[PDB]
């Protein structure tokens, strides 16, 4: 509850309460078995040798309770590969792309006849 | 490997330790106490655990006279002590800076030792900050009164709090943890303690492997004379055996007689080698009242290759108390 | 590998693993003989009294494995003089300018006659 | 200059040191041991290296009785010791906090000293954290049992790990390193050690400059009587000389007889001044069994101006083992 958790992102410190990260139990920072391999015991911190400006938006995802947004100086290719590492889910990724506008839900279902399907794609 | 490290620390202890609770200075005589330690030290045991609360301090006196009489090297022994109860005064209890420094200096004059290997906070103290405990434990290590320190019966949040104060203030973190672990007490050492071992490097030195003699199976026909349940002031152990939850446990121990018969072992040897079956438990503190019991319990190291995966699965179906993470 | 390397850029501290910087052995941070003169032994760190916002793009060059890009608040004259100091090569400089668009590969070869060459430049 | 700093540290040691391995407390008598140290101390040697493993602790006893008998000032001597092996018990080995503190205190009662100058970790310990070693080495320096500490046979990654713990926790980093360096062992002190010296300030105190007597050239006609290869329990040195890799080395030493003849020197004086030819090596630990050998080896300081660049190029063509960075 009061236990403060220090997360070190390539030399940048990000102290947080433990009950903030434990709000989302299936992410990398919420599951203690997942983040166990990043613990530095001599410094009492979690060290991630990752991107530095991406994590302030990842940290405020846990503090606000699910409101993440891309920082203005972090591109879409860099920041989307950080959401996949920190494991914020298939569910909070879809809320991210719609805000972004990268909403391409096009899935052409075939006609299923296997030739009615096959001739359909011909036209 | 008979000798194994204590946590991640460099302190090499044996896999079986000898405790002085009840027996030494209490139940058995000084001459039998001299004979049990010679039998233990000649079998490779170097871990000898005592406390200042045991026998109102008389248990450390008996242990102290044996090391001087036998002329054992202090280098070959690992002597551990526990501090929390010093006496009747209000300043003689707790984990304050006054009592850790006084109570360890008082124990080092009864043990007649220059220093002790591991000093153990015998229980947590809610009326003391964790800074004061970790600074006082660091103080008696830097003065040379102790080499290491550990905690006894502290929850894993209290151990992780004491670890984070030591990194904050550049103090010394604890290396060890004494937790009760037998076949009828599994929740802390299988769930809570393994998580702490891989994170910060705290090992477990488990005590009472036979649950004060219950798991030896001697109490199945009632209360035998001259056992611990019939001693003065131990009505809490007689109420534990004769109650309906304690009568149910003896019905499980008869089912464990068949598994101990399939191996060559007995039921005390089975109940100790079951405690050493994992890499998390760094030692087991025995208790022995005579030389037949101690020779029997040191025979539990041979039963440890006999335990396969299948016998561990078979015992846990009889016990029916495996914890869930 | 496991070893962590603290690089201090004018009071801003960046910590990265040694096997990240050793991915590129010919740069200033990859060659131990080159970065030997910047080591502060009393603090156990590499001190560079250099530009501060330039180095987050220089650090993420090593972490991503060769994907550098200019930060949005660092101009082109400042940031290009940092790539030459950190010695990221003649090869990763050309990939930088093409992204930038500062691609001027114009090299007028003369006709080589030495007057066929010389009269050519007259026209 | 004959006196030179030990690393970047302020400790001024002589360029030749005397070691107690084998000769003291073992091979030669106590009366010859008194005569070799008087011959060494009157030639300006202040570095006297011993260990607790040497002669089961009897080598420190011989050294200890000479300093009391001769009445040498402790201020004028640099006494160094090595702590890894204390005895047969499992707690008497390693670089744990129990054995460093316990071990050093046992060596200071055999040496009859109040302190040694540099305590060495005699080899690395894989079963101990580096925090526990650096905290225990810092502890015996702040108690006043040692002034400095160094490491023996540690990989330059292990030395750089021990350095980064000392800056993390505000502890004391090591100043020194003992590494084997002769004409047939060049990889650590010419490649790995130089990098460490300019980065963090660790010097080398190289031991066995004659490779236990091989490079003196005495073993070219087989095994002479009353040399170290014929002593009891040294079959590993006889197997090293008589093997086909060791017979090839003696064919190189005959080629070094011509280079030692061009100078005024001998082959032991050449093989020591070759070890002192660089600024990275801070000292050389000799070994001497009589007064003719020690007087010969202290004559290797005069050969050190005689080595030009060209003789160093000439020896390395004969040796054929120059390491590559
Ligand atoms: N808070 C703490 O840190 C804490 C608390 C308690 C104990 N401890 C440590 O752990 C040790 C005690 O463990 P424990 O004595 O409580 O449980 P055990 O499980 O260690 O108890 C052994 C006692 O039970 C009986 N027993 C043992 N082996 C037997 C055998 N093979 N056959 C028949 N009977 C046998 C003995 O005779 P009897 O049945 O006649 O008595 C003996 O006195 C102490 O020495 C103490 O140092 C620590
Ligand atoms: N791990 C470590 O840190 C470590 C390990 C080993 C040694 N050391 C240190 O280094 C020292 C030992 O060096 P070392 O003794 O092993 O190699 P040296 O190369 O130091 O060995 C000298 C021995 O070889 C023979 N010798 C020396 N000079 C000679 C000469 N001019 N002519 C003929 N024979 C000569 C001697 O007589 P004999 O041939 O009759 O014996 C002598 O006992 C010890 O004192 C020890 O303190 C440290």
Author numbering:
A (entry chain B), C (entry chain D): 31 to 153
B (entry chain A), D (entry chain C): 37 to 361
Quote the study on this structure:
Voltage-activated potassium (Kv) channels open in response to membrane depolarization to conduct K+ ions, a process that is critical for electrical signaling in neurons and endocrine cells, as well as muscle contraction. Kv channels contain voltage-sensing domains that activate with membrane depolarization, and a central pore domain that opens to conduct K+ ions with high selectivity. Since no structure has been obtained for a voltage-activated ion channel in a membrane environment, in the present study we solved the structure of the Kv chimera reconstituted in a lipid nanodisc environment using single-particle cryo-electron microscopy (cryo-EM).
We initially generated a map of the entire complex (α4β4) and obtained an average resolution of the entire map of 3.3 Å. However, the map exhibited a lower local resolution in the transmembrane domain (resolutions of ~4–7.5 Å), likely stemming from the alignment of particles against the cytosolic domain during 3D classification and 3D refinement, and the variability in relative arrangements of the cytosolic and transmembrane domains. We built three models for the Kv chimera: one for the cytosolic domain, another for the transmembrane domain, and a third hybrid model that combines the two models which fits in the overall 3.3 Å resolution map of the entire complex. We detected only subtle structural changes in the external pore in the selectivity filter of the Kv chimera, as well as a small rotation of the cytosolic region of the α subunit and the β subunit, a region involved in crystal packing in the X-ray structure. Our cryo-EM structure of the Kv chimera in nanodiscs suggests that the structural changes during C-type inactivation are likely not large, and would be compatible with very small movements on the scale <2 Å.
